[PDB]
Design a protein around this ligand. Structure first.
Ligand SMILES: NC(=[NH2+])c1cccc(/C=N/N/C(N)=[NH+]/N=C/c2cccc(C(N)=[NH2+])c2)c1
Lengths: 186, 186
Protein backbone atom coordinates (compact mmCIF):
# COMPACT_ATOMS: atom_id res chain seq x y z
CA UNK A 1 0.00 0.00 0.00
CA UNK A 2 1.12 3.66 0.15
CA UNK A 3 -0.92 5.55 2.74
CA UNK A 4 -0.13 2.47 4.81
CA UNK A 5 3.60 2.69 4.03
CA UNK A 6 3.58 6.20 5.46
CA UNK A 7 1.78 5.05 8.60
CA UNK A 8 4.46 2.37 8.76
CA UNK A 9 7.58 4.52 8.49
CA UNK A 10 6.11 7.19 10.75
CA UNK A 11 5.27 4.72 13.51
CA UNK A 12 8.89 3.51 13.23
CA UNK A 13 10.31 7.01 13.56
CA UNK A 14 7.87 8.05 16.28
CA UNK A 15 9.00 5.17 18.48
CA UNK A 16 12.74 5.43 17.87
CA UNK A 17 12.83 9.25 18.09
CA UNK A 18 10.31 11.55 19.72
CA UNK A 19 7.25 13.30 18.32
CA UNK A 20 8.91 16.70 17.91
CA UNK A 21 12.11 15.00 16.78
CA UNK A 22 10.92 13.25 13.59
CA UNK A 23 9.46 15.68 11.06
CA UNK A 24 7.16 15.29 8.05
CA UNK A 25 10.30 15.77 6.00
CA UNK A 26 11.71 12.40 7.03
CA UNK A 27 8.47 10.40 6.83
CA UNK A 28 7.98 11.54 3.24
CA UNK A 29 11.39 10.92 1.65
CA UNK A 30 11.87 7.75 3.73
CA UNK A 31 8.80 6.29 1.99
CA UNK A 32 10.13 7.28 -1.44
CA UNK A 33 7.08 9.53 -1.62
CA UNK A 34 6.57 13.27 -1.99
CA UNK A 35 5.39 16.05 0.33
CA UNK A 36 2.28 16.97 -1.66
CA UNK A 37 1.14 13.39 -1.03
CA UNK A 38 -0.46 14.31 2.29
CA UNK A 39 -3.98 15.72 2.53
CA UNK A 40 -7.33 13.85 2.81
CA UNK A 41 -5.53 11.23 4.91
CA UNK A 42 -2.54 12.99 6.48
CA UNK A 43 -2.57 16.78 6.12
CA UNK A 44 -1.06 17.71 9.49
CA UNK A 45 1.64 15.86 11.39
CA UNK A 46 -0.55 15.73 14.51
CA UNK A 47 -3.29 14.15 12.40
CA UNK A 48 -0.85 11.56 11.11
CA UNK A 49 0.42 10.79 14.61
CA UNK A 50 -3.03 10.78 16.24
CA UNK A 51 -4.06 8.32 13.52
CA UNK A 52 -1.25 5.89 14.37
CA UNK A 53 -2.17 6.04 18.07
CA UNK A 54 -5.67 5.13 17.00
CA UNK A 55 -4.42 2.12 14.99
CA UNK A 56 -2.03 0.73 17.60
CA UNK A 57 -4.83 1.25 20.09
CA UNK A 58 -6.98 -1.00 17.91
CA UNK A 59 -4.31 -3.62 17.41
CA UNK A 60 -3.61 -3.73 21.15
CA UNK A 61 -7.25 -4.08 22.34
CA UNK A 62 -7.80 -6.55 19.48
CA UNK A 63 -4.81 -8.60 20.67
CA UNK A 64 -6.06 -8.43 24.25
CA UNK A 65 -9.38 -9.90 23.12
CA UNK A 66 -7.63 -12.82 21.45
CA UNK A 67 -5.54 -13.37 24.58
CA UNK A 68 -7.68 -12.48 27.58
CA UNK A 69 -9.21 -15.95 27.31
CA UNK A 70 -6.27 -17.58 29.10
CA UNK A 71 -7.71 -16.01 32.28
CA UNK A 72 -10.91 -17.22 33.99
CA UNK A 73 -11.39 -14.89 36.98
CA UNK A 74 -11.16 -11.16 36.40
CA UNK A 75 -8.49 -11.05 39.10
CA UNK A 76 -6.47 -13.10 36.61
CA UNK A 77 -7.63 -10.82 33.82
CA UNK A 78 -5.99 -7.93 35.70
CA UNK A 79 -2.63 -9.75 36.11
CA UNK A 80 -2.59 -10.90 32.53
CA UNK A 81 -3.39 -7.47 31.05
CA UNK A 82 -0.46 -5.90 32.89
CA UNK A 83 2.09 -8.64 32.16
CA UNK A 84 1.10 -8.52 28.50
CA UNK A 85 1.51 -4.73 28.38
CA UNK A 86 5.21 -5.32 28.98
CA UNK A 87 5.55 -7.73 26.03
CA UNK A 88 3.17 -6.35 23.34
CA UNK A 89 4.35 -4.32 20.33
CA UNK A 90 1.31 -2.12 20.23
CA UNK A 91 0.53 1.30 21.71
CA UNK A 92 2.97 0.95 24.63
CA UNK A 93 6.12 1.33 22.51
CA UNK A 94 4.70 4.77 21.75
CA UNK A 95 4.17 6.10 25.29
CA UNK A 96 7.33 8.21 25.09
CA UNK A 97 6.29 9.92 21.83
CA UNK A 98 2.84 10.40 23.32
CA UNK A 99 4.12 12.27 26.41
CA UNK A 100 5.90 14.87 24.28
CA UNK A 101 2.82 15.28 22.13
CA UNK A 102 0.57 15.73 25.17
CA UNK A 103 2.75 18.61 26.37
CA UNK A 104 4.05 20.34 23.23
CA UNK A 105 0.47 20.37 21.92
CA UNK A 106 -1.73 21.20 24.89
CA UNK A 107 -2.92 24.55 23.51
CA UNK A 108 -4.98 23.22 20.58
CA UNK A 109 -8.50 21.81 20.19
CA UNK A 110 -7.17 18.48 18.93
CA UNK A 111 -5.90 17.56 22.41
CA UNK A 112 -8.78 17.85 24.86
CA UNK A 113 -11.11 16.49 22.17
CA UNK A 114 -9.57 14.78 19.10
CA UNK A 115 -7.50 12.38 21.20
CA UNK A 116 -9.82 12.70 24.16
CA UNK A 117 -11.54 9.33 23.89
CA UNK A 118 -8.20 7.80 22.93
CA UNK A 119 -7.57 7.61 26.67
CA UNK A 120 -11.01 6.26 27.51
CA UNK A 121 -10.21 3.28 25.27
CA UNK A 122 -6.95 2.83 27.20
CA UNK A 123 -8.67 2.79 30.60
CA UNK A 124 -11.57 0.87 29.09
CA UNK A 125 -9.84 -2.52 29.33
CA UNK A 126 -9.70 -1.95 33.10
CA UNK A 127 -13.20 -0.54 33.19
CA UNK A 128 -14.58 -3.93 32.19
CA UNK A 129 -12.19 -5.98 34.32
CA UNK A 130 -13.28 -4.07 37.43
CA UNK A 131 -16.97 -3.88 36.60
CA UNK A 132 -17.31 -7.54 35.50
CA UNK A 133 -15.34 -8.30 38.63
CA UNK A 134 -17.96 -6.57 40.76
CA UNK A 135 -20.64 -8.67 39.10
CA UNK A 136 -18.55 -11.84 39.35
CA UNK A 137 -18.07 -10.85 42.98
CA UNK A 138 -14.27 -10.83 43.26
CA UNK A 139 -14.14 -7.41 44.89
CA UNK A 140 -16.08 -4.21 45.44
CA UNK A 141 -15.00 -0.99 43.82
CA UNK A 142 -17.49 1.84 44.38
CA UNK A 143 -15.39 4.14 42.17
CA UNK A 144 -14.39 2.04 39.15
CA UNK A 145 -13.67 4.98 36.82
CA UNK A 146 -10.99 6.18 39.27
CA UNK A 147 -9.36 2.85 40.01
CA UNK A 148 -9.46 2.19 36.29
CA UNK A 149 -7.61 5.40 35.49
CA UNK A 150 -5.28 4.73 38.43
CA UNK A 151 -4.45 1.17 37.39
CA UNK A 152 -4.06 2.16 33.78
CA UNK A 153 -1.59 4.91 34.65
CA UNK A 154 0.23 3.08 37.41
CA UNK A 155 0.87 0.18 35.01
CA UNK A 156 1.93 2.40 32.11
CA UNK A 157 4.48 3.80 34.54
CA UNK A 158 5.99 0.43 35.29
CA UNK A 159 6.02 -0.37 31.57
CA UNK A 160 7.47 2.94 30.41
CA UNK A 161 10.04 3.79 33.12
CA UNK A 162 11.87 0.45 33.33
CA UNK A 163 12.35 -0.05 29.57
CA UNK A 164 16.06 -0.71 30.05
CA UNK A 165 16.41 -3.90 32.07
CA UNK A 166 16.00 -7.69 32.27
CA UNK A 167 12.56 -8.07 30.66
CA UNK A 168 11.90 -10.97 33.03
CA UNK A 169 12.54 -8.73 36.02
CA UNK A 170 9.91 -6.34 34.68
CA UNK A 171 7.39 -9.20 34.50
CA UNK A 172 8.13 -10.12 38.09
CA UNK A 173 7.63 -6.55 39.33
CA UNK A 174 4.48 -6.12 37.27
CA UNK A 175 3.01 -9.30 38.79
CA UNK A 176 4.19 -8.15 42.20
CA UNK A 177 2.35 -4.88 41.44
CA UNK A 178 -0.97 -6.50 40.46
CA UNK A 179 -0.83 -8.63 43.59
CA UNK A 180 -0.47 -5.51 45.78
CA UNK A 181 -3.10 -3.51 43.90
CA UNK A 182 -5.75 -6.22 43.94
CA UNK A 183 -5.00 -7.03 47.57
CA UNK A 184 -5.75 -3.35 48.21
CA UNK A 185 -9.08 -3.28 46.39
CA UNK A 186 -10.64 -6.25 48.18
CA UNK B 1 32.15 28.28 40.43
CA UNK B 2 32.95 28.78 36.75
CA UNK B 3 31.62 25.21 36.72
CA UNK B 4 28.64 26.10 38.89
CA UNK B 5 27.87 29.08 36.65
CA UNK B 6 27.95 26.85 33.56
CA UNK B 7 25.40 24.53 35.18
CA UNK B 8 23.09 27.35 36.21
CA UNK B 9 23.24 29.09 32.88
CA UNK B 10 22.71 25.78 31.16
CA UNK B 11 19.82 25.01 33.46
CA UNK B 12 18.24 28.34 32.37
CA UNK B 13 18.92 27.81 28.69
CA UNK B 14 17.45 24.26 28.67
CA UNK B 15 14.38 25.64 30.42
CA UNK B 16 13.78 28.61 28.15
CA UNK B 17 14.56 26.72 24.97
CA UNK B 18 14.47 22.99 25.60
CA UNK B 19 17.32 20.49 25.43
CA UNK B 20 17.83 19.85 21.73
CA UNK B 21 17.81 23.55 20.80
CA UNK B 22 20.39 24.57 23.38
CA UNK B 23 23.97 24.48 22.12
CA UNK B 24 27.16 24.13 24.13
CA UNK B 25 28.30 27.20 22.26
CA UNK B 26 25.58 29.27 23.88
CA UNK B 27 26.34 27.88 27.32
CA UNK B 28 30.03 28.70 26.85
CA UNK B 29 29.50 32.35 25.99
CA UNK B 30 26.68 33.17 28.42
CA UNK B 31 28.55 31.66 31.36
CA UNK B 32 31.66 33.40 30.05
CA UNK B 33 33.65 30.18 29.95
CA UNK B 34 35.03 28.10 27.08
CA UNK B 35 34.61 25.01 24.93
CA UNK B 36 37.80 23.82 26.63
CA UNK B 37 36.52 24.28 30.14
CA UNK B 38 33.05 22.87 29.37
CA UNK B 39 34.58 19.79 27.75
CA UNK B 40 36.90 19.29 30.74
CA UNK B 41 34.00 19.36 33.23
CA UNK B 42 31.27 17.50 31.39
CA UNK B 43 32.72 16.34 28.07
CA UNK B 44 29.27 16.50 26.51
CA UNK B 45 25.89 18.21 26.63
CA UNK B 46 24.56 14.73 27.51
CA UNK B 47 26.55 14.73 30.69
CA UNK B 48 26.13 18.39 31.51
CA UNK B 49 22.42 17.69 31.57
CA UNK B 50 22.91 14.61 33.79
CA UNK B 51 24.84 16.69 36.34
CA UNK B 52 22.15 19.35 36.42
CA UNK B 53 19.74 16.48 36.95
CA UNK B 54 21.91 15.14 39.77
CA UNK B 55 21.96 18.54 41.43
CA UNK B 56 18.19 18.87 40.99
CA UNK B 57 18.04 15.50 42.73
CA UNK B 58 20.06 16.59 45.79
CA UNK B 59 17.86 19.66 46.10
CA UNK B 60 14.80 17.45 45.86
CA UNK B 61 16.24 15.42 48.72
CA UNK B 62 17.19 18.39 50.91
CA UNK B 63 13.64 19.60 50.25
CA UNK B 64 12.04 16.20 51.07
CA UNK B 65 14.15 16.06 54.25
CA UNK B 66 12.64 19.25 55.66
CA UNK B 67 9.16 18.37 54.40
CA UNK B 68 8.71 14.85 55.82
CA UNK B 69 8.60 16.12 59.38
CA UNK B 70 4.95 16.90 58.58
CA UNK B 71 4.55 13.11 58.51
CA UNK B 72 4.90 11.30 61.83
CA UNK B 73 4.13 7.77 60.54
CA UNK B 74 5.68 6.32 57.38
CA UNK B 75 2.19 5.60 56.08
CA UNK B 76 1.93 9.37 56.06
CA UNK B 77 5.33 9.85 54.43
CA UNK B 78 4.12 7.62 51.58
CA UNK B 79 1.01 9.76 51.00
CA UNK B 80 2.95 13.00 51.31
CA UNK B 81 5.86 12.04 49.12
CA UNK B 82 3.51 10.91 46.33
CA UNK B 83 1.38 14.01 46.54
CA UNK B 84 4.48 16.25 46.51
CA UNK B 85 5.75 14.40 43.43
CA UNK B 86 2.52 15.12 41.62
CA UNK B 87 1.89 18.73 42.61
CA UNK B 88 5.48 19.89 42.38
CA UNK B 89 6.11 18.40 38.97
CA UNK B 90 3.05 20.19 37.56
CA UNK B 91 4.91 23.47 37.71
CA UNK B 92 8.47 22.26 37.34
CA UNK B 93 9.99 24.09 34.34
CA UNK B 94 12.93 21.74 33.75
CA UNK B 95 10.41 18.95 33.13
CA UNK B 96 10.02 19.69 29.43
CA UNK B 97 13.73 19.42 28.77
CA UNK B 98 13.80 16.23 30.86
CA UNK B 99 11.04 14.66 28.73
CA UNK B 100 12.86 15.76 25.60
CA UNK B 101 16.22 14.48 26.91
CA UNK B 102 14.82 11.18 28.16
CA UNK B 103 13.00 10.36 24.91
CA UNK B 104 16.24 11.07 23.11
CA UNK B 105 18.66 8.88 25.06
CA UNK B 106 16.65 5.92 26.40
CA UNK B 107 17.76 4.02 23.29
CA UNK B 108 21.48 4.89 23.50
CA UNK B 109 22.88 2.57 26.19
CA UNK B 110 25.84 4.85 26.95
CA UNK B 111 23.59 7.42 28.68
CA UNK B 112 22.01 4.54 30.65
CA UNK B 113 24.66 4.25 33.36
CA UNK B 114 24.50 7.58 35.21
CA UNK B 115 20.92 7.63 33.97
CA UNK B 116 20.15 4.91 36.49
CA UNK B 117 22.46 5.74 39.38
CA UNK B 118 20.09 8.71 39.27
CA UNK B 119 16.79 6.90 39.22
CA UNK B 120 18.06 4.75 42.04
CA UNK B 121 18.39 7.91 44.13
CA UNK B 122 14.69 8.55 43.60
CA UNK B 123 13.84 5.03 44.60
CA UNK B 124 15.87 5.34 47.81
CA UNK B 125 13.23 7.70 49.11
CA UNK B 126 10.70 4.85 48.91
CA UNK B 127 13.20 2.31 50.15
CA UNK B 128 13.73 4.34 53.31
CA UNK B 129 10.00 4.83 53.74
CA UNK B 130 9.33 1.11 53.40
CA UNK B 131 12.25 -0.14 55.49
CA UNK B 132 11.48 2.26 58.34
CA UNK B 133 7.85 1.22 57.93
CA UNK B 134 8.90 -2.31 58.84
CA UNK B 135 10.79 -1.28 61.97
CA UNK B 136 7.49 0.21 63.15
CA UNK B 137 5.08 -2.58 62.37
CA UNK B 138 3.39 -0.17 60.01
CA UNK B 139 3.52 -3.08 57.60
CA UNK B 140 5.64 -6.12 56.86
CA UNK B 141 7.50 -6.14 53.55
CA UNK B 142 10.18 -8.76 53.00
CA UNK B 143 10.99 -7.65 49.44
CA UNK B 144 11.37 -3.91 50.05
CA UNK B 145 13.69 -3.16 47.10
CA UNK B 146 10.97 -4.65 44.90
CA UNK B 147 7.96 -2.88 46.36
CA UNK B 148 10.13 0.25 46.11
CA UNK B 149 10.87 0.08 42.36
CA UNK B 150 7.19 -0.66 41.96
CA UNK B 151 5.83 2.30 43.91
CA UNK B 152 8.38 4.61 42.33
CA UNK B 153 7.50 3.73 38.77
CA UNK B 154 3.75 3.45 39.42
CA UNK B 155 3.64 6.87 41.09
CA UNK B 156 5.79 8.27 38.31
CA UNK B 157 3.28 6.91 35.81
CA UNK B 158 0.29 8.41 37.60
CA UNK B 159 2.08 11.76 37.58
CA UNK B 160 3.11 11.63 33.92
CA UNK B 161 0.14 9.98 32.24
CA UNK B 162 -2.70 11.71 34.01
CA UNK B 163 -1.52 15.09 32.65
CA UNK B 164 -4.98 16.14 31.43
CA UNK B 165 -7.76 17.62 33.67
CA UNK B 166 -8.18 19.67 36.87
CA UNK B 167 -5.28 19.47 39.35
CA UNK B 168 -7.59 18.75 42.24
CA UNK B 169 -8.83 15.54 40.66
CA UNK B 170 -5.25 14.43 39.96
CA UNK B 171 -4.33 14.84 43.59
CA UNK B 172 -7.53 12.98 44.48
CA UNK B 173 -6.46 10.02 42.32
CA UNK B 174 -2.88 10.09 43.57
CA UNK B 175 -4.20 9.84 47.13
CA UNK B 176 -6.61 7.08 46.14
CA UNK B 177 -3.66 5.13 44.73
CA UNK B 178 -1.55 5.62 47.88
CA UNK B 179 -4.46 4.33 49.94
CA UNK B 180 -4.99 1.15 47.86
CA UNK B 181 -1.28 0.38 47.52
CA UNK B 182 -0.64 0.75 51.23
CA UNK B 183 -3.67 -1.45 51.86
CA UNK B 184 -2.40 -4.24 49.65
CA UNK B 185 0.71 -4.38 51.81
CA UNK B 186 -0.70 -4.95 55.30
N1 LIG C 1 8.62 22.29 43.86
C1 LIG C 1 9.82 21.73 43.77
N2 LIG C 1 10.78 22.09 44.62
C2 LIG C 1 10.08 20.77 42.80
C3 LIG C 1 9.06 20.35 41.95
C4 LIG C 1 9.29 19.37 40.99
C5 LIG C 1 10.56 18.80 40.89
C6 LIG C 1 11.59 19.23 41.72
C7 LIG C 1 12.87 18.72 41.54
N3 LIG C 1 13.06 17.84 40.58
N4 LIG C 1 14.16 17.35 40.34
C8 LIG C 1 14.24 16.47 39.34
N5 LIG C 1 13.14 16.15 38.67
N6 LIG C 1 15.40 15.90 39.01
N7 LIG C 1 15.40 15.00 37.99
C9 LIG C 1 16.62 14.55 37.74
C10 LIG C 1 16.78 13.40 36.97
C11 LIG C 1 18.06 12.97 36.63
C12 LIG C 1 18.22 11.86 35.81
C13 LIG C 1 17.11 11.18 35.32
C14 LIG C 1 15.83 11.61 35.66
C15 LIG C 1 14.72 10.90 35.21
N8 LIG C 1 13.49 11.36 35.43
N9 LIG C 1 14.88 9.76 34.55
C16 LIG C 1 15.67 12.72 36.48
C17 LIG C 1 11.35 20.21 42.68
Amino acid sequence: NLKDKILGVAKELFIKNGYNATTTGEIVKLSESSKGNLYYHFKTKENLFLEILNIEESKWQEQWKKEQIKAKTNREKFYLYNELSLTTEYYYPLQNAIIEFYTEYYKTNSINEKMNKLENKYIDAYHVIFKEGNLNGEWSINDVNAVSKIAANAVNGIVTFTHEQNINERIKLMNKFSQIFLNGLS
